[PDB]
Amino acid sequence: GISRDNWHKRRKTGGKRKPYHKKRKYELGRPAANTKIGPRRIHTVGVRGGNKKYRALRLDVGNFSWGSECCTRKTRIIDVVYNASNNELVRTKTLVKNCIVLIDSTPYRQWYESHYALPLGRKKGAKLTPEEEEILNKKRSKKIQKKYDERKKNAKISSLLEEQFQQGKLLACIASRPGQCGRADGYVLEGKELEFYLRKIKARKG
Amino acid sequence: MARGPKKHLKRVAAPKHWMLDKLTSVFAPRPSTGPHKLRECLPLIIFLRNKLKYALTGDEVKKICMQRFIKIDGKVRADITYPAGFMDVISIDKTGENFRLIYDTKGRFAVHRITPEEAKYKLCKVRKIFVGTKGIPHLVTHDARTIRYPDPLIKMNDTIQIDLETGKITDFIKFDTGNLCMVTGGANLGRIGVITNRERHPGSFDVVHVKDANGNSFATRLSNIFVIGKGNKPWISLPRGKGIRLTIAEERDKRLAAKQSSG
Amino acid sequence: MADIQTERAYQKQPTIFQNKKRVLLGETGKEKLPRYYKNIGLGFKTPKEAIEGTYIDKKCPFTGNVSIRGRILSGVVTKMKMQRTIVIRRDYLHYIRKYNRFEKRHKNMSVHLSPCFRDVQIGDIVTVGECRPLSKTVRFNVLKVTKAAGTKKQFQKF
RNA sequence: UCGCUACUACCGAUUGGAUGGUUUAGUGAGGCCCUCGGAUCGGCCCGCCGGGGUGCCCUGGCGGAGCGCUGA
RNA sequence: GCUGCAGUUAAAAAGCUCGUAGUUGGAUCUUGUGGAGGGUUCCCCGCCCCUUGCCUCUCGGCGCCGGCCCGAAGCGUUUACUUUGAAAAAAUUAGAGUGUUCAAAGCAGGCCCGAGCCGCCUGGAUACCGCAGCUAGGAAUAAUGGAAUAGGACCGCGGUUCUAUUUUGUUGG
RNA sequence: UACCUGGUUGAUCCUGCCAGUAGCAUAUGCUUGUCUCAAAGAUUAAGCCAUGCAUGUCUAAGUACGCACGGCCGGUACAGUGAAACUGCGAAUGGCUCAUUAAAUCAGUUAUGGUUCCUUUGGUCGCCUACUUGGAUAACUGUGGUAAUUCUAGAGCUAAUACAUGCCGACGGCGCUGACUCCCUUUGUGUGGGAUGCGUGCAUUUAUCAGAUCAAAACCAACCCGGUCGGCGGCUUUGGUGACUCUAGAUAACCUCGGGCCGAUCGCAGCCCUCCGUGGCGGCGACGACCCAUUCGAACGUCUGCCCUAUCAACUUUCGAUGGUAGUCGCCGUGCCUACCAUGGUGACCACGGGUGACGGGGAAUCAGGGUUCGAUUCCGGAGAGGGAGCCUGAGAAACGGCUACCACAUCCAAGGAAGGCAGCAGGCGCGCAAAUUACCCACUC
């Protein structure tokens, strides 16, 4: 119906070619996923040669990663901020490859606190002392220090990172096609990208 | 016509090395899918009534194959058509006969009878090396056998002897200059001669010179060469003719010399 | 180099990561970027200029994804007026067997040009090679540029 | 030149007629996708009986309640 | 009417000139001698300076007595042309074989034995395939190429800068 | 066989055309003994169609309580033969037509390192239920409706390699945590063992790491061996291509259920029991399933090749034209599509436009040499089934011997409705100068 033909469209000279063969099943469209954020709705689509293709509508979880220290945990996908293909897609909260979105930022802290033995940015130390100090202080004899010594000075954590934990959000990059895969996935922004997209955000809105 | 795959091949579309006539009807057998390619096959039924003449109609072959007197590559087959090609062994155990499919210098599949002892193995070219899962290797051959754990110095364009009984190759030949080779396709076909020289081009369609024991030099593409044994010493039995590739004048001279068309 | 972004998106090479390990360079140092390149094979050589320089382009074969496989051809420059591509020409001779004469015919083709080459001028010989499609009228990329023909680009004293 | 017959082409009022294809705008069948919709049909919990077991349990048969929760 | 036409008078050179595309374009850059194949000088190795132009070498063979020699590796500024290979569906066509009763065809068929051989022998060639593309040899012919506001040659030296990761058994400064 | 002859004048020599001459293929007239081979509604109307037929299918081996036949008596998987019905598979092959179609089709040449692939062939096959789980449908039995259809309702039964579920065996698997404990330097750090936790097959998606060897020395810090109570000599680790972000490996995770895999299936014939029908196991098949390879292909892409026309010379663009960047979609590559941005692309070497009684090629007729003309048509490729569009099923179709709608036709009707597409074989009407039997048969060839 809606098709992805190539026997339409002008040649280089501005010429036209007269109608040749009728539309066929291997040149075919099928309308866009237009996936949002919400409760999971998945549809299974039969596709050529078999080998079913998953189309995801309204995901709310993706597997992001923090490849700086190589941990990857499942985290909720809150809202869109920047979509580098169009401005309109952000307004209706459409989710596609290479967007910039927000997450809860929760397990990354839990991992950091247990492994590097330090909290991130904090409102107050009063919260920590009755519980959440129980993990941070430890009763080991022998391997209070012995393990943790090797973790020291490999946890400088950068300025633009640390400030974001306090808000409870982090900026990560969709590196999947949700409409073809059936899953959202990605990597979290680091380095110069994370400097770049801040400037685009503050430029465009506000 | 086409919307999917075809299931007919006519008489006149079919290759000329099956030596078909033109006064039986429009269709020809067409080999069904298998390890060999249809411009290199000899379909089974063409061996049984257009060569050896046991059968006379296609319905007779259907009554023969069901009885399970036929084998191919030491296993039992039971259909009108099977796509056996170069270097396979047919085995009828009731008559005590064994055949081999190999090329005349004319370039067509002949009758090359052999001892049953010879018919316990065949010679197979290596074409591709492919590392499988968890650090295990594979071979790929033209008869489409995947033989795991080969020796780690065997590479493509070599040939390997396979025991039909147990698989799992016992020995091999290494591709080297001065080893004896047979041709399997192209304009030169059925010629036997040593390698002599190689030629390489980065890209594709490298060629391979050849010379025989009649003092003639010729060349062919790389991928039409098949190794048969070390220099002037085949590790297989050879038919009459022996890759000489006589001119037409000399062939005339032989026939009028023996005066041979009667016994 | 220090600016290579003008898009609404960030530009970078695949197969590159930014580590956050160690901290001590003093003033400056590693630009926090190792360069990516690869061999092309077939007796063609990567330019020094590619490995030195900084550009992000995915359609050149010295950096980005695209192979050269199949044919290899030549041509000549005729025009450049487009960004990250050029136009070229192929002069050749068509024969007629009723007559015993030839006649001239030419076709024109576009082909993509790397930001690596920037010494191109209109009239240089160019070499190209078959590739997978990049665009509607681009199927090729440059492998090499040369000048080795009459009325050279600069005075003889080289 | 003018007069006589066969015959062919052209111009032409009629703003000719007929048939076919393009083209702006409006209207728009049918299917597909998406978002809703819930006719309707079941399952599992509490009574009585049958079987097994420790007034109660499991399973089967039968009825009724909330039709609670749940699937199609 | 390319091979192969015609234009004073028979049908026919723009009134005349300039002019871009197109087509076409002067001359000029190497010859003799022993061996081998064919004559009585002349047409695969070498020699005058050159001879398939060079090196540089290093890794895997051949040698000869650690030391030394020569095949494969980059190529001779680029093309056309010509010559050799590769790769080309069948039928048709040319064409070999075969007594279809001869032929148009066809791909067959021919042999010795009373059957007592339980068989023997043999064919189903070969050629052609505009182009364009792939391969190797030739260097005449026709295009294209270089140092004249100098850079070619040699481990000739300086000045200046960047970088390679090998070795002091290993791992770090 | 590389050939000419008649006709302008009173007569002659030219120029030039007309006529004569031979072949080929269509029609037509007249005539016609015997023998073999055989083209045949293409030309025009890809006009329209009565009737008949042209695609179905069971083995020892998916499912047999047909009140069928049969039985030697049965059912205790249970018969032998078996209509019907569910299930699997095919119906996308062939046959036919030449309407569309001028860089399109198609041919030669190349490319998947840009992809998909039923099937065959070869490999892949263990991290109050398991002596076998769950509940309905047909045939069948019985009652009906409609003018009419290969229409269809209601009731009562009963199956599975249909449908929906889900163990066990043999896990004595791996890394990182380290309750702890022991020796020597409090610690740190050098040590040896260690309970207790979580993950630990392949496939799927993401991030990260590795994917080694070049050329030599001088001292200092931690250190092996040849060996000693501060210092000398000796080592270093997958596969493949011309070339890949390749192959295989490691780490951290992701998991699709109703929507990855890892057998609750069927048929032949044998055995062994610290031993008496169980607990065990062996051969031969049949079917199914996941992945890899293979075969048959499919789909896009490279270079070169085209008939007539200028009384067609400028064409193409936000109704994407050319390119850049990102995304969507798709089996994949790609302005294929969308957003943003640039202003390009093509042409006197004939673009663009128009015409074609133009499907293309392998070829055919004529022919000294060079050519000219034809190619609907038996082989190969393509396109289409009254005209348009959409879609289901499947590995493969935008299918018409499938479906839905519109438009042009045409049929039946109780006027409520219902049914149809001969460019398949025959046959009829029409059209024309113009073209065959409503025959016989699956024996050959497939």
PDB file of all heavy atoms in Angstrom, chain E residues 4 167 171-173, chain F residues 217 219-221 369:
ATOM      1  P     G E   4      36.086   1.171 -53.710  1.00  0.00           P
ATOM      2  OP1   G E   4      35.561  -0.068 -54.326  1.00  0.00           O
ATOM      3  OP2   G E   4      37.334   1.731 -54.271  1.00  0.00           O
ATOM      4  O5'   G E   4      34.965   2.277 -53.756  1.00  0.00           O
ATOM      5  C5'   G E   4      34.874   3.184 -54.849  1.00  0.00           C
ATOM      6  C4'   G E   4      33.503   3.877 -54.898  1.00  0.00           C
ATOM      7  O4'   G E   4      32.449   2.921 -55.174  1.00  0.00           O
ATOM      8  C3'   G E   4      33.066   4.542 -53.579  1.00  0.00           C
ATOM      9  O3'   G E   4      32.240   5.684 -53.807  1.00  0.00           O
ATOM     10  C2'   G E   4      32.269   3.431 -52.905  1.00  0.00           C
ATOM     11  O2'   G E   4      31.357   3.910 -51.949  1.00  0.00           O
ATOM     12  C1'   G E   4      31.563   2.826 -54.078  1.00  0.00           C
ATOM     13  N9    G E   4      31.153   1.428 -53.853  1.00  0.00           N
ATOM     14  C8    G E   4      31.979   0.332 -53.775  1.00  0.00           C
ATOM     15  N7    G E   4      31.328  -0.786 -53.627  1.00  0.00           N
ATOM     16  C5    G E   4      30.011  -0.423 -53.602  1.00  0.00           C
ATOM     17  C6    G E   4      28.876  -1.249 -53.508  1.00  0.00           C
ATOM     18  O6    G E   4      28.875  -2.475 -53.462  1.00  0.00           O
ATOM     19  N1    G E   4      27.707  -0.480 -53.435  1.00  0.00           N
ATOM     20  C2    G E   4      27.637   0.918 -53.501  1.00  0.00           C
ATOM     21  N2    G E   4      26.396   1.439 -53.333  1.00  0.00           N
ATOM     22  N3    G E   4      28.745   1.679 -53.706  1.00  0.00           N
ATOM     23  C4    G E   4      29.874   0.950 -53.715  1.00  0.00           C
ATOM     24  P     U E 167      62.203  -6.862  24.103  1.00  0.00           P
ATOM     25  OP1   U E 167      61.964  -8.319  24.183  1.00  0.00           O
ATOM     26  OP2   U E 167      61.517  -6.019  25.107  1.00  0.00           O
ATOM     27  O5'   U E 167      63.761  -6.608  24.232  1.00  0.00           O
ATOM     28  C5'   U E 167      64.672  -7.299  23.366  1.00  0.00           C
ATOM     29  C4'   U E 167      66.074  -6.694  23.470  1.00  0.00           C
ATOM     30  O4'   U E 167      66.074  -5.265  23.254  1.00  0.00           O
ATOM     31  C3'   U E 167      66.734  -6.844  24.832  1.00  0.00           C
ATOM     32  O3'   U E 167      67.236  -8.181  24.989  1.00  0.00           O
ATOM     33  C2'   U E 167      67.803  -5.771  24.728  1.00  0.00           C
ATOM     34  O2'   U E 167      68.848  -6.221  23.902  1.00  0.00           O
ATOM     35  C1'   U E 167      67.069  -4.642  24.049  1.00  0.00           C
ATOM     36  N1    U E 167      66.526  -3.632  25.021  1.00  0.00           N
ATOM     37  C2    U E 167      67.425  -2.839  25.720  1.00  0.00           C
ATOM     38  O2    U E 167      68.643  -2.938  25.568  1.00  0.00           O
ATOM     39  N3    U E 167      66.829  -1.909  26.579  1.00  0.00           N
ATOM     40  C4    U E 167      65.461  -1.688  26.789  1.00  0.00           C
ATOM     41  O4    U E 167      65.064  -0.804  27.551  1.00  0.00           O
ATOM     42  C5    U E 167      64.614  -2.574  26.033  1.00  0.00           C
ATOM     43  C6    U E 167      65.159  -3.484  25.208  1.00  0.00           C
ATOM     44  P     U E 171      58.963  -7.177  30.770  1.00  0.00           P
ATOM     45  OP1   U E 171      57.873  -7.173  29.769  1.00  0.00           O
ATOM     46  OP2   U E 171      60.233  -6.514  30.392  1.00  0.00           O
ATOM     47  O5'   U E 171      58.433  -6.532  32.114  1.00  0.00           O
ATOM     48  C5'   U E 171      57.148  -6.918  32.621  1.00  0.00           C
ATOM     49  C4'   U E 171      56.939  -6.334  34.023  1.00  0.00           C
ATOM     50  O4'   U E 171      57.978  -6.788  34.932  1.00  0.00           O
ATOM     51  C3'   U E 171      57.015  -4.811  34.130  1.00  0.00           C
ATOM     52  O3'   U E 171      55.764  -4.242  33.728  1.00  0.00           O
ATOM     53  C2'   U E 171      57.372  -4.608  35.591  1.00  0.00           C
ATOM     54  O2'   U E 171      56.252  -4.781  36.429  1.00  0.00           O
ATOM     55  C1'   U E 171      58.350  -5.738  35.823  1.00  0.00           C
ATOM     56  N1    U E 171      59.772  -5.285  35.653  1.00  0.00           N
ATOM     57  C2    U E 171      60.317  -4.494  36.658  1.00  0.00           C
ATOM     58  O2    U E 171      59.675  -4.175  37.656  1.00  0.00           O
ATOM     59  N3    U E 171      61.647  -4.098  36.440  1.00  0.00           N
ATOM     60  C4    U E 171      62.455  -4.421  35.333  1.00  0.00           C
ATOM     61  O4    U E 171      63.622  -4.033  35.249  1.00  0.00           O
ATOM     62  C5    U E 171      61.792  -5.236  34.348  1.00  0.00           C
ATOM     63  C6    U E 171      60.522  -5.623  34.542  1.00  0.00           C
ATOM     64  P     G E 172      55.730  -2.794  33.090  1.00  0.00           P
ATOM     65  OP1   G E 172      54.351  -2.507  32.631  1.00  0.00           O
ATOM     66  OP2   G E 172      56.821  -2.664  32.098  1.00  0.00           O
ATOM     67  O5'   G E 172      56.046  -1.899  34.352  1.00  0.00           O
ATOM     68  C5'   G E 172      56.528  -0.565  34.159  1.00  0.00           C
ATOM     69  C4'   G E 172      56.719   0.113  35.518  1.00  0.00           C
ATOM     70  O4'   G E 172      57.489  -0.757  36.412  1.00  0.00           O
ATOM     71  C3'   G E 172      57.569   1.392  35.463  1.00  0.00           C
ATOM     72  O3'   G E 172      56.803   2.552  35.119  1.00  0.00           O
ATOM     73  C2'   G E 172      58.111   1.437  36.876  1.00  0.00           C
ATOM     74  O2'   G E 172      57.109   1.778  37.806  1.00  0.00           O
ATOM     75  C1'   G E 172      58.499   0.002  37.058  1.00  0.00           C
ATOM     76  N9    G E 172      59.843  -0.232  36.486  1.00  0.00           N
ATOM     77  C8    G E 172      60.193  -0.956  35.364  1.00  0.00           C
ATOM     78  N7    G E 172      61.471  -0.909  35.105  1.00  0.00           N
ATOM     79  C5    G E 172      61.997  -0.114  36.095  1.00  0.00           C
ATOM     80  C6    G E 172      63.312   0.369  36.219  1.00  0.00           C
ATOM     81  O6    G E 172      64.228   0.081  35.442  1.00  0.00           O
ATOM     82  N1    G E 172      63.423   1.212  37.356  1.00  0.00           N
ATOM     83  C2    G E 172      62.378   1.552  38.234  1.00  0.00           C
ATOM     84  N2    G E 172      62.694   2.388  39.260  1.00  0.00           N
ATOM     85  N3    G E 172      61.126   1.076  38.062  1.00  0.00           N
ATOM     86  C4    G E 172      61.013   0.288  36.980  1.00  0.00           C
ATOM     87  P     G E 173      57.524   3.660  34.227  1.00  0.00           P
ATOM     88  OP1   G E 173      56.533   4.697  33.865  1.00  0.00           O
ATOM     89  OP2   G E 173      58.252   3.010  33.116  1.00  0.00           O
ATOM     90  O5'   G E 173      58.574   4.282  35.232  1.00  0.00           O
ATOM     91  C5'   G E 173      58.170   5.031  36.377  1.00  0.00           C
ATOM     92  C4'   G E 173      59.364   5.817  36.941  1.00  0.00           C
ATOM     93  O4'   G E 173      60.401   4.883  37.359  1.00  0.00           O
ATOM     94  C3'   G E 173      60.101   6.748  35.965  1.00  0.00           C
ATOM     95  O3'   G E 173      59.404   7.993  35.858  1.00  0.00           O
ATOM     96  C2'   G E 173      61.466   6.849  36.630  1.00  0.00           C
ATOM     97  O2'   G E 173      61.448   7.733  37.729  1.00  0.00           O
ATOM     98  C1'   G E 173      61.683   5.449  37.125  1.00  0.00           C
ATOM     99  N9    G E 173      62.491   4.659  36.167  1.00  0.00           N
ATOM    100  C8    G E 173      62.054   4.000  35.038  1.00  0.00           C
ATOM    101  N7    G E 173      63.017   3.404  34.390  1.00  0.00           N
ATOM    102  C5    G E 173      64.150   3.696  35.107  1.00  0.00           C
ATOM    103  C6    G E 173      65.482   3.338  34.816  1.00  0.00           C
ATOM    104  O6    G E 173      65.811   2.649  33.848  1.00  0.00           O
ATOM    105  N1    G E 173      66.366   3.881  35.785  1.00  0.00           N
ATOM    106  C2    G E 173      65.985   4.676  36.884  1.00  0.00           C
ATOM    107  N2    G E 173      66.994   5.133  37.677  1.00  0.00           N
ATOM    108  N3    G E 173      64.685   4.971  37.138  1.00  0.00           N
ATOM    109  C4    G E 173      63.851   4.467  36.214  1.00  0.00           C
TER     110        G E 173
ATOM    111  P     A F 217      72.261  -5.254  24.466  1.00  0.00           P
ATOM    112  OP1   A F 217      73.044  -6.501  24.620  1.00  0.00           O
ATOM    113  OP2   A F 217      71.007  -5.145  25.242  1.00  0.00           O
ATOM    114  O5'   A F 217      73.184  -4.027  24.860  1.00  0.00           O
ATOM    115  C5'   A F 217      73.301  -3.728  26.266  1.00  0.00           C
ATOM    116  C4'   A F 217      73.722  -2.274  26.450  1.00  0.00           C
ATOM    117  O4'   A F 217      72.768  -1.404  25.806  1.00  0.00           O
ATOM    118  C3'   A F 217      73.736  -1.786  27.895  1.00  0.00           C
ATOM    119  O3'   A F 217      74.955  -2.188  28.533  1.00  0.00           O
ATOM    120  C2'   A F 217      73.582  -0.284  27.707  1.00  0.00           C
ATOM    121  O2'   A F 217      74.793   0.316  27.318  1.00  0.00           O
ATOM    122  C1'   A F 217      72.603  -0.219  26.555  1.00  0.00           C
ATOM    123  N9    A F 217      71.222  -0.063  27.034  1.00  0.00           N
ATOM    124  C8    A F 217      70.288  -1.019  27.331  1.00  0.00           C
ATOM    125  N7    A F 217      69.169  -0.518  27.771  1.00  0.00           N
ATOM    126  C5    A F 217      69.355   0.832  27.794  1.00  0.00           C
ATOM    127  C6    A F 217      68.455   1.866  28.092  1.00  0.00           C
ATOM    128  N6    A F 217      67.144   1.561  28.357  1.00  0.00           N
ATOM    129  N1    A F 217      68.990   3.129  28.033  1.00  0.00           N
ATOM    130  C2    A F 217      70.281   3.271  27.690  1.00  0.00           C
ATOM    131  N3    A F 217      71.188   2.353  27.336  1.00  0.00           N
ATOM    132  C4    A F 217      70.649   1.130  27.399  1.00  0.00           C
ATOM    133  P     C F 219      75.617  -0.319  34.970  1.00  0.00           P
ATOM    134  OP1   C F 219      76.841  -1.119  35.201  1.00  0.00           O
ATOM    135  OP2   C F 219      74.355  -1.060  34.739  1.00  0.00           O
ATOM    136  O5'   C F 219      75.437   0.694  36.172  1.00  0.00           O
ATOM    137  C5'   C F 219      74.598   0.351  37.287  1.00  0.00           C
ATOM    138  C4'   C F 219      73.929   1.606  37.861  1.00  0.00           C
ATOM    139  O4'   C F 219      73.394   2.446  36.800  1.00  0.00           O
ATOM    140  C3'   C F 219      72.710   1.311  38.747  1.00  0.00           C
ATOM    141  O3'   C F 219      73.127   0.953  40.075  1.00  0.00           O
ATOM    142  C2'   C F 219      71.930   2.609  38.628  1.00  0.00           C
ATOM    143  O2'   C F 219      72.514   3.632  39.404  1.00  0.00           O
ATOM    144  C1'   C F 219      72.103   2.924  37.159  1.00  0.00           C
ATOM    145  N1    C F 219      70.991   2.337  36.328  1.00  0.00           N
ATOM    146  C2    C F 219      69.738   2.957  36.295  1.00  0.00           C
ATOM    147  O2    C F 219      69.578   4.008  36.938  1.00  0.00           O
ATOM    148  N3    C F 219      68.735   2.391  35.552  1.00  0.00           N
ATOM    149  C4    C F 219      68.944   1.222  34.874  1.00  0.00           C
ATOM    150  N4    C F 219      67.963   0.609  34.156  1.00  0.00           N
ATOM    151  C5    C F 219      70.224   0.587  34.918  1.00  0.00           C
ATOM    152  C6    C F 219      71.191   1.154  35.647  1.00  0.00           C
ATOM    153  P     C F 220      72.263  -0.099  40.897  1.00  0.00           P
ATOM    154  OP1   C F 220      73.007  -0.482  42.117  1.00  0.00           O
ATOM    155  OP2   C F 220      71.847  -1.191  39.988  1.00  0.00           O
ATOM    156  O5'   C F 220      70.985   0.724  41.313  1.00  0.00           O
ATOM    157  C5'   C F 220      71.055   1.793  42.257  1.00  0.00           C
ATOM    158  C4'   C F 220      69.686   2.488  42.371  1.00  0.00           C
ATOM    159  O4'   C F 220      69.355   3.083  41.083  1.00  0.00           O
ATOM    160  C3'   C F 220      68.458   1.613  42.683  1.00  0.00           C
ATOM    161  O3'   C F 220      68.334   1.386  44.096  1.00  0.00           O
ATOM    162  C2'   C F 220      67.332   2.451  42.094  1.00  0.00           C
ATOM    163  O2'   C F 220      67.020   3.553  42.916  1.00  0.00           O
ATOM    164  C1'   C F 220      67.964   2.937  40.810  1.00  0.00           C
ATOM    165  N1    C F 220      67.653   2.008  39.668  1.00  0.00           N
ATOM    166  C2    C F 220      66.373   2.007  39.107  1.00  0.00           C
ATOM    167  O2    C F 220      65.533   2.817  39.536  1.00  0.00           O
ATOM    168  N3    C F 220      66.089   1.114  38.106  1.00  0.00           N
ATOM    169  C4    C F 220      67.015   0.199  37.696  1.00  0.00           C
ATOM    170  N4    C F 220      66.742  -0.753  36.761  1.00  0.00           N
ATOM    171  C5    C F 220      68.324   0.210  38.261  1.00  0.00           C
ATOM    172  C6    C F 220      68.584   1.099  39.224  1.00  0.00           C
ATOM    173  P     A F 221      67.874  -0.058  44.584  1.00  0.00           P
ATOM    174  OP1   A F 221      68.162  -0.181  46.030  1.00  0.00           O
ATOM    175  OP2   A F 221      68.465  -1.082  43.694  1.00  0.00           O
ATOM    176  O5'   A F 221      66.302  -0.038  44.374  1.00  0.00           O
ATOM    177  C5'   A F 221      65.502   0.837  45.189  1.00  0.00           C
ATOM    178  C4'   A F 221      64.014   0.679  44.835  1.00  0.00           C
ATOM    179  O4'   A F 221      63.780   1.204  43.508  1.00  0.00           O
ATOM    180  C3'   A F 221      63.435  -0.746  44.779  1.00  0.00           C
ATOM    181  O3'   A F 221      63.082  -1.204  46.091  1.00  0.00           O
ATOM    182  C2'   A F 221      62.256  -0.559  43.836  1.00  0.00           C
ATOM    183  O2'   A F 221      61.165   0.048  44.494  1.00  0.00           O
ATOM    184  C1'   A F 221      62.828   0.408  42.823  1.00  0.00           C
ATOM    185  N9    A F 221      63.443  -0.297  41.675  1.00  0.00           N
ATOM    186  C8    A F 221      64.781  -0.426  41.371  1.00  0.00           C
ATOM    187  N7    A F 221      65.008  -1.116  40.293  1.00  0.00           N
ATOM    188  C5    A F 221      63.777  -1.487  39.838  1.00  0.00           C
ATOM    189  C6    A F 221      63.422  -2.214  38.692  1.00  0.00           C
ATOM    190  N6    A F 221      64.409  -2.622  37.838  1.00  0.00           N
ATOM    191  N1    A F 221      62.075  -2.436  38.537  1.00  0.00           N
ATOM    192  C2    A F 221      61.229  -1.944  39.461  1.00  0.00           C
ATOM    193  N3    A F 221      61.472  -1.211  40.557  1.00  0.00           N
ATOM    194  C4    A F 221      62.790  -1.013  40.697  1.00  0.00           C
ATOM    195  P     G F 369      30.134 -12.642 -49.541  1.00  0.00           P
ATOM    196  OP1   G F 369      30.535 -13.590 -48.478  1.00  0.00           O
ATOM    197  OP2   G F 369      28.760 -12.100 -49.480  1.00  0.00           O
ATOM    198  O5'   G F 369      31.158 -11.438 -49.578  1.00  0.00           O
ATOM    199  C5'   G F 369      32.558 -11.679 -49.407  1.00  0.00           C
ATOM    200  C4'   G F 369      33.310 -10.343 -49.395  1.00  0.00           C
ATOM    201  O4'   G F 369      33.276  -9.762 -50.718  1.00  0.00           O
ATOM    202  C3'   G F 369      32.716  -9.238 -48.511  1.00  0.00           C
ATOM    203  O3'   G F 369      33.120  -9.433 -47.156  1.00  0.00           O
ATOM    204  C2'   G F 369      33.312  -8.004 -49.170  1.00  0.00           C
ATOM    205  O2'   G F 369      34.672  -7.846 -48.841  1.00  0.00           O
ATOM    206  C1'   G F 369      33.184  -8.354 -50.629  1.00  0.00           C
ATOM    207  N9    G F 369      31.911  -7.847 -51.176  1.00  0.00           N
ATOM    208  C8    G F 369      30.699  -8.497 -51.257  1.00  0.00           C
ATOM    209  N7    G F 369      29.753  -7.756 -51.756  1.00  0.00           N
ATOM    210  C5    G F 369      30.352  -6.550 -52.003  1.00  0.00           C
ATOM    211  C6    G F 369      29.781  -5.385 -52.535  1.00  0.00           C
ATOM    212  O6    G F 369      28.589  -5.284 -52.846  1.00  0.00           O
ATOM    213  N1    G F 369      30.762  -4.374 -52.678  1.00  0.00           N
ATOM    214  C2    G F 369      32.120  -4.490 -52.344  1.00  0.00           C
ATOM    215  N2    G F 369      32.904  -3.420 -52.653  1.00  0.00           N
ATOM    216  N3    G F 369      32.613  -5.611 -51.761  1.00  0.00           N
ATOM    217  C4    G F 369      31.692  -6.584 -51.654  1.00  0.00           C
TER     218        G F 369
END
